[PDB]
Point group: C3
């Protein structure tokens, strides 16, 4: 199925989030997952009270929930992509980023008054 | 056990969140799960920077973590309920909502200086 | 591997969050998990619109994602620790706290352009 969602939490200021970033994340993830952009959801949360390694330089905590398209090599590619994007667009060092991956069962994803199973 | 928690993240403005909405979610979920309202926790996050399908009309990303009471049919009923509530109260179209469901092991839920196992 | 991350969401005001709290959480969790503080990430979210049991006294919803070091007894110790910290520092009653525990596969944790597997 086509469902995937990406969340990034960061201490980086809202002003540093470029315009079009939501569409950028959406479409890059659509390319990466082989899912249509219409069912990719994205959520960016700046100005958070956060630390990585006990210090407060720019950092991010992210998650990608997806129905399928999750696994070792795939997650490696996603990590390369997303760390690249966060470094280029949000000035965050890749070694200060965690991304948690979740392969969701269709039956555990609600949408449009039902689930995807 | 009685533990369940619901989170909704949305780009909908804080002003559009009606008064009593937390209690409404709590009690509707208590009905739905057959759990006492005293152990239902609720978290609503408005004004978020979000997109669904690459566009920023009202949308929501939600999760329901629960000890038990999670599964295909149950999740379908929850989705009908919650999409209904989000549409009625938050003006969000049900086809712009994801709800992730999690059946949590008692041993993986901390509360009151211990866990539920 | 060394990766662990902790998030706490609470309705408690930002002003009630003491200075040094991020480092405190980081180091206490480093002690608790036997992981180096350099790979512990922490995220604190105050002033949230939240309820526990349908009422809005101070409460928290937290999560600890970790590569390993998760299980029954361990989670009990973590819960004692974290509820203690939240009560002492954030004035939150331990019976109004949920902490969800996640043992993450190395292959499902992205960091530094790759994963931990």
């Amino acid at each position: 199925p086509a469902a995937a969602m990406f969340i990034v939490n960061t201490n980086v200021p809202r002003a540093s989030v470029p315009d079009g970033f939501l569409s950028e994340l959406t479409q890059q993830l659509a390319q990466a997952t082989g899912k249509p952009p219409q069912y990719i959801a994205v959520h960016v949360v700046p100005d958070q009270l956060m630390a990585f390694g006990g210090s407060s330089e720019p950092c991010a905590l992210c998650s990608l929930h997806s129905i399928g398209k999750i696994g070792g090599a795939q997650n490696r590619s996603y990590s390369k992509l997303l760390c690249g994007l966060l470094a280029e667009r949000l000035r965050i060092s890749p070694d200060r980023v965690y991304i948690n991956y979740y392969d969701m069962n269709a039956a555990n994803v609600g949408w449009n008054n039902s689930t995807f199973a």
